[PDB]
Amino acid sequence: ERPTFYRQELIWEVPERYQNLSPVGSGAYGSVCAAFDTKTGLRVAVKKLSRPFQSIIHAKRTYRELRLLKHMKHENVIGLLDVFTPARSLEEFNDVYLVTHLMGADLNNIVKCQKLTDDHVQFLIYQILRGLKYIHSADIIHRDLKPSNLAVNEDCELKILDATRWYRAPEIMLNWMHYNQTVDIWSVGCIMAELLTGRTLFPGTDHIDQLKLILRLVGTPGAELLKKISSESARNYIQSLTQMPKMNFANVFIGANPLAVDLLEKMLVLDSDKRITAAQALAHAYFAQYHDPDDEPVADPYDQSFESRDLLIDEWKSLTYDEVISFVPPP
Numbered sequence: 001e002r003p004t005f006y007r008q009e010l011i012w013e014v015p016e017r018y019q020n021l022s023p024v025g026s027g028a029y030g031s032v033c034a035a036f037d038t039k040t041g042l043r044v045a046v047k048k049l050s051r052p053f054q055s056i057i058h059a060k061r062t063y064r065e066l067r068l069l070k071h072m073k074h075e076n077v078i079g080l081l082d083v084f085t086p087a088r089s090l091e092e093f094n095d096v097y098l099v100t101h102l103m104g105a106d107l108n109n110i111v112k113c114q115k116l117t118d119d120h121v122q123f124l125i126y127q128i129l130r131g132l133k134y135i136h137s138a139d140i141i142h143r144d145l146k147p148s149n150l151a152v153n154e155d156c157e158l159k160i161l162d163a164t165r166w167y168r169a170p171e172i173m174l175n176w177m178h179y180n181q182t183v184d185i186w187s188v189g190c191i192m193a194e195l196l197t198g199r200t201l202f203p204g205t206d207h208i209d210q211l212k213l214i215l216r217l218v219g220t221p222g223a224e225l226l227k228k229i230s231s232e233s234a235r236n237y238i239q240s241l242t243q244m245p246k247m248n249f250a251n252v253f254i255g256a257n258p259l260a261v262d263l264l265e266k267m268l269v270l271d272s273d274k275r276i277t278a279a280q281a282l283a284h285a286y287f288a289q290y291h292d293p294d295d296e297p298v299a300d301p302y303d304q305s306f307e308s309r310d311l312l313i314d315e316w317k318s319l320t321y322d323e324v325i326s327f328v329p330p331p
């Protein structure tokens with residue numbers, strides 16, 4: 001049958017299994033409380049979606065978020081321990097709560113603007129890439145990978161969730177579309193660089209500065225890249241710049257493990273088609289001590305056809321309700 005609920009003001013209405021509700025992040029992740037799950041003995045985070053069925057777009061967003069989190073089942077990706085509503089029917093259904101592991105910190109919190117050891121960077125980047133492989137295998141592109149979106153606990157176990165512009169692929173900065181999954185690989189390279197050196201790779205002051213700093217490291221586009229640019233305004237502007245050569249990453253990241261440097265060379269290539277994939281990165285010798293080709297799992301096909309659909313509020317709501325009811329908690 002149905003769990004007993006209680007009501008509290010932080011008027012959250014949750015099952016009794018969740019105790020010690022305490023607001024976290026204040027606003028950054030929405031309305032989220034840390035809590036203790038008495039059923040599992042785990043510290044959890046409970047998110048109450050805001051106004052989930054106020055509008056078609058709210059409704060579609062609610063459905064999108066629930067679908068995604070229900071699909072993501074991987075050690076290095078945030079997924080769902082639980083989903084619940086106080087509603088006992090569809091006509092009653094107005095609130096949606098998601099539950100996941102309370103990791104307790106994000107990457108910023110672990111680095112502290114300091115140098116990590118090479119071994120530690122291997123472990124952290126390995127986890128990010130393991131998680132990314134899974135995500136990309138579901139035909140998902142993250143698009144905003146950054147330290148604040150990488151959750152970590154005290155044992156630096158890491159899960160991918162979900163300052164601002166510093167990790168973004170340059171094609172994203174320039175509103176390219178046709179985006180490759182390797183946009184996320186660019187983001188990994190920027191993160192890795194920072195963990196090794198203790199400094200932001202491209203700390204741009206604004207958008208244009210950010211692209212200037214990128215180009216100074218990885219050079220101006222070669223002919224092979226320029227032949228794939230269909231916008232003549234973009235093409236013509238690029239060529240009018242002073243040519244710069246790629247910097248030698250070996251001089252830039254001096255002291256670094258040469259295999260770390262080699263991996264950075266392969267991630268931080270301007271041409272997204274020439275960037276290493278997550279699967280390929282995991283097989284790179286940098287991660288010899290953690291790589292296991294038989295425990296780098298991939299995802300079930302992920303049907304995102306709903307994105308192209310224009311439905312009514314009550315349709316998105318009923319579909320969301322269906323997903324709440326069909327949820328099966330992880331073993």
Ligand SMILES: C[C@@H]1CN(Cc2ccc(F)cc2)[C@@H](C)CN1C(=O)c1cc2c(C(=O)C(=O)N(C)C)cn(C)c2cc1Cl
Pocket residue numbers: 024025029032034045046047069078079080098099100101102103104105106109148150151152161
């Ligand atoms: C992934 C979980 C769940 N939570 C949101 C969430 C996502 C999906 C879901 F189903 C339920 C909740 C994230 C916002 C943060 N989160 C954390 O573990 C977390 C938790 C914290 C955190 C705190 O816990 C905190 O405020 N203190 C005082 C320890 C401080 N920071 C910087 C944090 C960063 C993260 Cl990523």
Ligand SMILES: CCCCCCCCO[C@@H]1O[C@H](CO)[C@@H](O)[C@H](O)[C@H]1O
Pocket residue numbers: 170171174176177178179180211221225228238270271272273
């Ligand atoms: C002015 C700064 C130059 C930025 C060049 C970004 C090149 C990224 O690379 C491009 O990514 C596209 C997908 O996003 C692909 O369709 C292209 O084939 C690929 O070359």
